[PDB]
Amino acid sequence: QKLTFTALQQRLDSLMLRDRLRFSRRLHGVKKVKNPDAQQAIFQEMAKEIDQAAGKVLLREAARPEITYPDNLPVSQKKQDILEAIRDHQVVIVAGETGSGKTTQLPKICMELGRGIKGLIGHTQPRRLAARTVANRIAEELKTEPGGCIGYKVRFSNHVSDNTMVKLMTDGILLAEIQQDRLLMQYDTIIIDEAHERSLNIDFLLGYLKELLPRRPDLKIIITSATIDPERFSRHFNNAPIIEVSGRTYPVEVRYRPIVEEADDTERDQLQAIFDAVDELSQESPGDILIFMSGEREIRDTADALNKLNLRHTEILPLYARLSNSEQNRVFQSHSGRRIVLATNVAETSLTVPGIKYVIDPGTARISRYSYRTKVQRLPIEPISQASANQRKGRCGRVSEGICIRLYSEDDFLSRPEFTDPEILRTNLASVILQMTALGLGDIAAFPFVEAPDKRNIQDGVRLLEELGAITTDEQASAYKLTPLGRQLSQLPVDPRLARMVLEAQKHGCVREAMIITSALSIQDPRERPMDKQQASDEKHRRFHDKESDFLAFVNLWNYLGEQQKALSSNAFRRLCRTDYLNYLRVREWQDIYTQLRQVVKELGIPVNSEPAEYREIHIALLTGLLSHIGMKDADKQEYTGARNARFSIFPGSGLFKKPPKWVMVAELVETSRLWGRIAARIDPEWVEPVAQHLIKRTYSEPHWERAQGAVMATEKVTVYGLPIVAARKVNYSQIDPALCRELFIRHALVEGD
């Protein structure tokens, strides 16, 4: 026997990863024990604990199943190169076309190497549904049960069973586990799936794993994506190998059917194109059709029209994000007839619906993009990229001859960008900092991004988060921390400026008005102004203009839209959007944003008022998001002075262009020919001080003794970003700065004034 520290140190390699450091720190410290035989007594008893820990590993190895790979998958051919690539390299990139076996067979290859035993095999998906279904598919193929070696994790802590070897999860779950597992010791291997989608979660995970490699040499990383730019991921991990895999896809015929303006209605021509496409495909075969839609409200309207057509032996089923257990399994089930599945772009990330023969691609998706001309994070309905359009097309390459109908010209298609911009380059950096600080990812400049955002916008995002009171601005030692308000901002799906207004609406019982206005400002203005019908449309939109705030016009329009869809049918309401020069798709998207926002507001415990709020309550809440968008009008000129000594004028289309008040707040500042203030509202300067306690700068002048007061009085000036919200008010200086009053009293310079 005669156990040693050196010999026991070697035994730690037979332990689970998350156990090694616990026994290392204890072995380092037995040297403090003075009695050399009392050391051996501690060694013998620690060797018993290490016996128990090492037996844990031997039990997991015995419980591992025989790994089998199904035939007909093209990835099992490159299984050789894949296996030894992960065996010999810390990082491996595996790019493969849709339907190659990639996703379900990669964790099997890792288990074949002997991983998943001393630490989990983590496998991330962008959406929660994709994680659950992938887990079930691997377990089925391995003949294991739910609760066996294959598990899944959502719902941030309902953690998987002890039998689990391969843990599937969402990428937001893994990021959440960083806070308490900083080194990710729970895992032997980490697989980032669908990386090409390149969201914030994806790029945050690829950055953190770059920082983790020098600290986790026992860790293996596999990045798997589509054929979209595999070099990018390789270049990031010090040029890690790439293994291309082929897809089995059947050839897909593409038919270009552009929209022809005949009904004088953009929406009627859209749905008549949807109708003519299903009608075209109906002549080929009664194969199931998948229709990509812009938003969940358009899905409702389109499924409505399709059903009222009563196509024979067709089952028109919609897909919303509100799909529950009882509703998500229906698309993965057998059907006696034809299925017409209307889905959003979610049918490209996670939804991989089976039995899809045809596809109808309108070619438009809602995408989160930061505006440069103005600033707000917006959600424009944009034409998708070629790579996005091809993934929509690739969703029917499993039957003999699929057909994809694109509702646009080939010339349109070939003119779009090849690839979609990464979200890190599309997002307001204030929002990126909010998430990074909430997750603990550190400084935005120190972070090793796969594609770093522009450094200049960094200090602007920091100032915005300070303006909104979202970050500490306290010298902790040197770092950033979220305030309780800033943590709430990170959860709302609108811009930080807009989110700050909703949070302040709680104090003023105007959350409804705030959500209406905030969601309106998140999209391109739904009120259209055709160049052939300028005067007609102007007459229509004047029905909602307010004399003091054209923020409230959004509220008047919302109430109008809400009352009309009560009395009107689906068809009649889409007809009303044409007669009122309202963009139907953006009216529906407006309603979509409001619904998503309303749900986050409710799960924040924030109540929504049922009774309308008045001017003051609304615009004070708006003001807290527009503190650097305040304007003080010049005496004679009709121009304003802005925050940073800037100077702007009211937009000519504004309701305040006729009568510009002394103090305004503007939603956006744009520079076309002069500095312009778009959507604007009269305010009171008295409102600014109570909501700007973190920005106000107080100066004092004319300090003098006053007999009547028995104290030193002065004149106080309060500025927010240099604007004089409080020009001059008499204060009791003796209660503010008694030191200066003394310094001034012994200079013989006090003598009483007024």
Q: In residues, how long is the chain? A: 754
- Two tokens at 311? 């196509």
For residue 345, the tally of other CB atoms under 10 A from its CB is: 19
CA distance 646 to 556: 32
| 144 among annotated binding-site residues | no
CA distance 724 to 631: 10
Q: What is the β-pairing status of strands 220-225 and 187-192?
A: parallel
CA distance 302 to 315: 13
Pick from 345, 439, 445: nearest CA to 395: 345
* Paired strand residues for 622: none
Q: What is the β-pairing status of strands 91-96 and 150-153?
A: unpaired
Interruption sites in the chain after residues (C→N beyond 2.5 Å): none
- Two tokens at 418? 């090849």
Inter-residue contact 33 to 39 (CB < 8 Å): yes
- Two tokens at 569? 């049918």
| 97 among annotated binding-site residues | yes
- Two tokens at 198? 């390149």
Please write down the HEC assignment for all residues of 35-72.
Answer: CHHHHHHHHHHHHHHHHHHHHHHHHHHHHCCCCCCCCC
Provide the residue type at 31 as one letter.
Answer: K
Could you tell me which residues come within 8 angstroms of residue 201 by beta carbon, excluding any fewer than 6 positions away?
Answer: 126, 171, 172, 175
Residue with tokens 């040499």: 217
For residue 628, the tally of other CB atoms under 10 A from its CB is: 20
Q: What is the CA radius of gyration of the chain?
A: 31
Residue with tokens 């001059």: 728
3 state SS of 100: coil
CA distance 443 to 614: 42
| 99 among annotated binding-site residues | yes
3 state SS of 436: helix
- Two tokens at 548? 């003091």
Element (H, E) at 663: strand 663-666
Task: Report DSSP state, residue 89.
Answer: -
Q: What are the E-state strand segments in 372-490?
A: 377-378, 381-383, 402-406
- Two tokens at 64? 């591992």
| 102 among annotated binding-site residues | yes
3 state SS of 433: helix
End-to-end, the C-alpha distance of the chain in Å comes to 95
Pick from 508, 513, 551: nearest CA to 682: 551
Provide the residue type at 452 as one letter.
Answer: A
CA distance 390 to 406: 10
| Inter-CA distances, 453 with 22, 461, 730, Å | 39, 12, 48
For residue 288, the tally of other CB atoms under 10 A from its CB is: 22
DSSP 401-423: TEEEEESS-HHHHHHS-SSPPPH
| 247 among annotated binding-site residues | no
| 101 among annotated binding-site residues | yes
Pick from 423, 414, 425, 369: nearest CA to 389: 414
CA distance 38 to 250: 72
**Binding-site annotation, residues for ATP:** 96-103
**Binding-site annotation, residues:** 96-103
